[PDB]
Design an enzyme around this catalytic site. Structure first.
Site, PDB file in Angstrom:
ATOM      1  N   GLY A 159      72.040  27.702  64.065  1.00 49.18           N
ATOM      2  CA  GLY A 159      72.049  28.927  63.045  1.00 49.18           C
ATOM      3  C   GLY A 159      71.944  29.874  64.510  1.00 49.18           C
ATOM      4  O   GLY A 159      72.428  29.758  64.582  1.00 49.18           O
ATOM      5  N   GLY A 160      70.709  30.886  63.579  1.00 48.76           N
ATOM      6  CA  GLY A 160      70.672  32.413  64.042  1.00 48.76           C
ATOM      7  C   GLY A 160      71.830  32.914  64.339  1.00 48.76           C
ATOM      8  O   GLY A 160      72.050  33.883  63.775  1.00 48.76           O
ATOM      9  N   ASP A 191      85.244  19.105  68.306  1.00 46.99           N
ATOM     10  CA  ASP A 191      84.806  19.320  70.010  1.00 46.99           C
ATOM     11  C   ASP A 191      84.579  19.785  69.958  1.00 46.99           C
ATOM     12  O   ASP A 191      86.469  20.495  70.161  1.00 46.99           O
ATOM     13  CB  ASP A 191      85.062  17.944  71.102  1.00 46.99           C
ATOM     14  CG  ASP A 191      84.501  18.392  72.544  1.00 46.99           C
ATOM     15  OD1 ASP A 191      83.918  18.855  73.112  1.00 46.99           O
ATOM     16  OD2 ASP A 191      85.629  17.380  73.721  1.00 46.99           O
ATOM     17  N   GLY A 192      84.527  20.928  70.617  1.00 45.74           N
ATOM     18  CA  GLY A 192      85.034  22.520  71.387  1.00 45.74           C
ATOM     19  C   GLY A 192      86.068  22.421  72.497  1.00 45.74           C
ATOM     20  O   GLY A 192      86.780  23.192  72.674  1.00 45.74           O
ATOM     21  N   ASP A 229      78.379  29.327  72.722  1.00 49.55           N
ATOM     22  CA  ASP A 229      76.714  29.402  73.553  1.00 49.55           C
ATOM     23  C   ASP A 229      77.100  27.665  73.475  1.00 49.55           C
ATOM     24  O   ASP A 229      76.691  27.277  72.559  1.00 49.55           O
ATOM     25  CB  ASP A 229      76.194  30.018  72.276  1.00 49.55           C
ATOM     26  CG  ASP A 229      74.585  29.192  72.039  1.00 49.55           C
ATOM     27  OD1 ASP A 229      74.664  29.555  73.257  1.00 49.55           O
ATOM     28  OD2 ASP A 229      74.166  28.760  71.702  1.00 49.55           O
ATOM     29  N   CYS A 275      71.243  29.539  76.714  1.00 53.00           N
ATOM     30  CA  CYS A 275      69.408  30.052  76.982  1.00 53.00           C
ATOM     31  C   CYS A 275      68.998  29.711  77.978  1.00 53.00           C
ATOM     32  O   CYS A 275      67.886  28.876  77.732  1.00 53.00           O
ATOM     33  CB  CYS A 275      69.441  28.725  75.177  1.00 53.00           C
ATOM     34  SG  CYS A 275      69.695  29.943  73.554  1.00 53.00           S
TER      35      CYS A 275
END
Ligand SMILES: [Mg+2]
Ligand SMILES: [Mg+2]
Ligand SMILES: [Mg+2]
Ligand SMILES: [Mg+2]
Ligand SMILES: [Mg+2]
Ligand SMILES: [Mg+2]
Ligand SMILES: [Mg+2]
Ligand SMILES: [Mg+2]
Ligand SMILES: [Mg+2]
Lengths: 52, 137, 41, 95, 95, 338
Positions: free
Chosen positions: F139-140, F191-192, F209, F264
């Site tokens: 989210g975010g 998958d990225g 991210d 993060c």
RNA sequence: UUAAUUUAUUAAUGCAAACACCUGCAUUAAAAAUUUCGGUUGGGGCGACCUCGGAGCAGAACCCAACCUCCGAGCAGUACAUGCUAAGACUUCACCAGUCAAAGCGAACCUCAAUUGAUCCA
RNA sequence: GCCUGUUUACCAAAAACAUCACCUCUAGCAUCACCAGUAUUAGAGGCACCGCCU
RNA sequence: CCGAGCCUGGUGAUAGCUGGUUGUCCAAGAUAGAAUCUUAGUUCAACUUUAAAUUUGCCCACAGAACCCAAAUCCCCUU
């Protein structure tokens, strides 16, 4: 999340039925079929049965 | 009954020797006014979380200080990493600061010499800890 | 006595029911109109 | 169950069976569907209707219940207004 | 007195027969301990002048402790039986 | 099997294991700042209220201002020479009231870490930009991007169907179905790493991210802690996976397009070495040159609200402080020159 | 033993009862008492798994294991007739449970993989 | 391991147990132990003579 | 013959575990699985036995059973 709430017939009958609504959402008023009165009537949320 | 139950808490539930109990009563009379339960919590906070043994708890008037101050300063240092609860073997990676260096010293001296931080940070941490305690209760 | 009390309570509720339904529907519609007005800004 | 009671020497009845099942004199056993009172809010109307019904038991289940209950429960009962009076007997049954 | 009640109901014994008890019938729950009941007063007829209660021949409700410890043992009072009440009634009407 | 062993390794909670690792690493990394960072991480996290632009944004902003929260984004734009997220003043610990549905049927605001918004702001979504979110699915940042003006569609991908479902639920709660119906929002459970092959030279703006140690969540939540022993293999291989994901995003972005790599965690290994290795791998194996944009002006602009680790080579690092418990957040901006 | 259940027993107190002892009821300890220590996998570890669903193995009705290969779910959204009833069928190899449903009454003119939990008892 | 002694009668006599010495804790007291005793005493416990340092 | 004496009694303790389970003769007769503090067991199902009822059972000709992306099987009148 959602909470299970008891909608009670506004027709004066003791008829009740349970629905789901978001906890953050406002208390629920809803048309629903009342078997005793045999007619669609308003139902108003009375109390929160449980949280889900 | 009040005096006897205070002494009994200090003896049976805190395992202080008789001489230690007399010295505690002599040095920290406010213990008698302090209610049971709170006193046991303070003692166990010193014993387990802070790893302070009975001779140290008696030599330094730890029971004199308030539980709020004790928790504030100790938890501040612990989260900062300065303090560390002794392990099962009773050993710490870095020697812990002395109880006199934690509680007896003024707030400014505690923050400068031991914590090495700012009064603003300490106030923020105090408010946060108070909120956390209230929510826990 | 209980039967007639229930019946008359139901009668009063039914008499009020159409107006209550109309008022609730009008409230929903006016809330939607207020939302559209807010969208318009 | 107790095949011979210590005080009378008679066969005993498993009252858990009596509390749960109805025996029609024909030999059929009726029951409620498990979960017919549980978490109805998450059950569809068709499922609720299926659960709210009275259901017959298998041959082996009926035999088990007959063994577990004594002959007193396997008698003719002429109750006043029994809703199951009609169901107590079978009709037009071929083998 | 301690008043107790069986946890398990004892099956009826009959008319001339004595109930047959078992291990489960020896389990009790305390329904009441009479010593914790609120104190009631004892009625007594005074025979001699006594401070703060009465003079003579007057029914008085005194604490059971005082009535049984001071008045009655020392003869300052007598039980408020019908006979004593009658006797003191004749005493009164003879004055 | 062998039942009776000589010595069993002490059973540590994953939180304490994470504390041990973070101590032994970040103490060296940050010197005297590690005490403050540790206390901030172990203290309560400061939340920001991102007002849902789709909802009655003005009314919700007024209500938050009455609650005494100020728009850090607005003040940053004030001295920069479309997002609105309110935060309390420095040192204040006040909590925002729980967000509730508005009149329009969408949640008035989202309570999210303010630092998590900085990557999106630095991405600089130009009006009508095709956007990719390679793995950002908590989210975010995704909601912030959608509230921004990426009307040329946004492809949000993740490898975790659970997080995809969470994204879908927050989108249902916040973004209007009218906005979400078209290809404006495409949510995928792929998958990225495969994304470089799936699409290349397509997106003008990319947000990668990558999964990371999520230091604060590792320290707080016991469940699914990256630092538990069973997940040692995943923890060890995390840098390689992050490099692969950043390389895939760089391949996907159009030549001259911008990407932002976000993490993060405080780990120099997981942030600066990850970005540098991604650049090197892209320039060698695929022969594509990427230039790291300078975010120092971003640091100065947002310094009033966030405390930044000044000693950073590539990118920016919001460190959690007690006065502003908004970190941790590393973000590096990279423009694909070729 | 910081496993579960107890404090019957003692030692303290407190409240009652009596005018310190005794009795009753509580609270705290000491002391003990009863009972248990699931399952499938893993020899060089510091554990994994236990229920439900999709795909290959299992190519074409059904069925098919694995200490096999992969992927997922423990919800959400809508609606408030998501009401009542009822032939006939399916069914995860038993049962339990789970499915579909004509017609009819009454009304208008739910979706998709799983998304769950029996009895007793409250 | 200070030493003399003690121990698994019936597979271990030992470095184990005890041991003088030292140390810790508890107790202000009488008519059945402790004790017909009273803080230089009594009980529970650790460790192991002595000596040397810090 | 003490990690808790010995004797008697409860006591024919219990044991999903081991062992044993005694005349003649004939006949039918072998393993789909599920659940289970369950995989050394048991309940149901499957298979098997007996008796009874009435009527189709098997083998099986066409026809018929999917798109995505081989051997065969199912159903099946005749025989
Ligand atoms: Mg009789
Ligand atoms: Mg079946
Ligand atoms: Mg020797
Ligand atoms: Mg010798
Ligand atoms: Mg020997
Ligand atoms: Mg010998
Ligand atoms: Mg020998
Ligand atoms: Mg036997
Ligand atoms: Mg044969």
């Amino acid at each position: 999340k959602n909470i299970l709430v008891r909608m009670v017939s506004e027709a004066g009958t003791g008829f009740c039925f349970n629905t789901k609504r978001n906890r953050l959402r406002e208390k629920l008023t809803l048309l629903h079929y009342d078997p005793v009165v045999k007619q669609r009537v308003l139902f108003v949320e009375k109390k929160k049965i449980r949280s889900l | 009954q009040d005096i006897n139950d205070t002494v009994r808490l200090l003896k049976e539930k805190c395992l202080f020797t008789v001489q230690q109990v007399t010295k505690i009563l002599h040095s920290c009379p406010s213990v008698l006014r302090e209610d049971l339960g709170q006193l046991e919590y303070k003692f166990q906070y010193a014993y387990f979380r802070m790893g302070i043994k009975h001779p140290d708890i008696v030599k330094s008037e730890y029971l004199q200080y308030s539980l709020t101050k004790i928790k504030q300063r100790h938890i501040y240092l612990e989260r900062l990493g300065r303090y560390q609860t002794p392990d099962k073997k009773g050993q710490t990676q870095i020697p812990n600061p002395l109880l006199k260096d934690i509680l007896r010293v003024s707030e400014a001296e505690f923050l400068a010499r031991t914590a090495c931080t700012s009064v603003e940070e300490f106030q923020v941490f105090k408010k946060l800890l108070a909120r956390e305690e209230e929510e826990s209760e | 006595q209980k039967r007639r009390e229930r019946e008359q309570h139901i009668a009063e509720c039914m008499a009020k029911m159409p107006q209550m339904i109309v008022n609730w529907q009008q409230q929903q519609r006016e809330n939607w109109e207020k939302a559209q007005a807010d969208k318009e800004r | 169950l107790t095949y011979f009671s210590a005080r009378k020497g008679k066969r005993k009845t498993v009252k858990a069976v009596i509390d749960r099942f109805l025996r029609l004199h024909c030999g059929l056993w009726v029951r409620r569907k498990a979960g017919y009172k549980k978490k109805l809010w998450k059950k569809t109307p068709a499922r609720k209707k299926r659960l709210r019904e009275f259901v017959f038991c298998n041959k082996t289940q009926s035999k088990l219940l007959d063994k577990m209950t004594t002959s007193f429960w396997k008698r003719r009962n002429w109750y006043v207004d029994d809703p199951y009076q009609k169901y107590h007997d079978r009709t037009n049954l071929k083998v | 007195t301690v008043i107790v009640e069986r946890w398990w109901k004892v099956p009826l014994a009959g008319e001339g027969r004595k109930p047959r008890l078992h291990r489960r019938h020896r389990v009790y729950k305390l329904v009441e301990d009479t010593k914790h009941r609120p104190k009631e007063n004892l009625e007594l007829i005074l025979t001699q002048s006594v401070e703060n209660v009465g003079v003579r021949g007057d029914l008085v409700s005194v604490k059971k402790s005082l009535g049984r410890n001071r008045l009655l043992p020392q003869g300052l009072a007598v039980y408020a039986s019908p006979e004593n009440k009658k006797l003191f009634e004749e005493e009164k009407l003879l004055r | 099997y062998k039942k009776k062993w000589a010595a069993t390794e002490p059973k540590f909670p994953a939180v304490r294991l994470a504390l041990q690792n973070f101590d032994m690493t970040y103490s060296v990394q940050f010197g005297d700042l590690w005490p403050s960072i540790r206390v901030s991480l172990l203290s309560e996290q400061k939340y920001g209220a991102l007002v849902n632009n789709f909802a009655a944004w003005d009314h919700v902003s007024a209500k938050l201002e009455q609650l005494s929260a100020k728009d850090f984004v607005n003040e940053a734009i004030s001295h920069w020479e479309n997002l609105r997220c309110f935060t309390f003043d420095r040192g204040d610990i006040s909590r925002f009231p729980p967000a509730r549905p508005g009149s329009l049927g969408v949640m008035e605001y989202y309570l999210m870490d303010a630092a998590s918004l900085l990557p999106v702001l630095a991405l600089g979504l130009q009006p009508g930009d095709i956007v990719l979110d390679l793995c950002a699915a908590p989210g975010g940042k995704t909601l912030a991007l959608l509230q921004t003006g990426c009307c040329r569609n946004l492809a949000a991908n993740d490898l975790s169907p659970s997080r995809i479902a969470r994204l879908q639920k927050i989108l249902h709660s916040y973004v209007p179905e009218e906005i979400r119906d078209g290809n404006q929002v495409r949510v995928t459970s792929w998958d990225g790493r495969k994304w470089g092959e799936l699409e290349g030279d397509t997106y003008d703006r990319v947000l990668v991210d990558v999964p990371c140690t999520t230091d604060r969540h590792s320290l707080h939540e016991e469940e699914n802690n990256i630092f538990k022993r069973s997940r040692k293999k995943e923890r060890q291989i995390l840098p390689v996976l992050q490099v692969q994901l950043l390389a895939a995003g760089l391949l996907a972005t159009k030549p001259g397009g911008h990407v932002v790599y976000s993490t993060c965690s405080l780990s120099h290994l997981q942030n600066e070495y990850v970005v540098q290795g991604a650049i090197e791998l892209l320039a060698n194996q695929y022969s594509i040159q990427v230039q790291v944009e300078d975010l120092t002006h971003f640091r100065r602009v947002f310094m009033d609200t966030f405390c930044f680790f000044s000693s950073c080579q590539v990118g920016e690092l919001v460190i959690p402080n007690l006065m502003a418990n908004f970190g941790p957040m590393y973000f590096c901006k990279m423009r694909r020159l070729t």
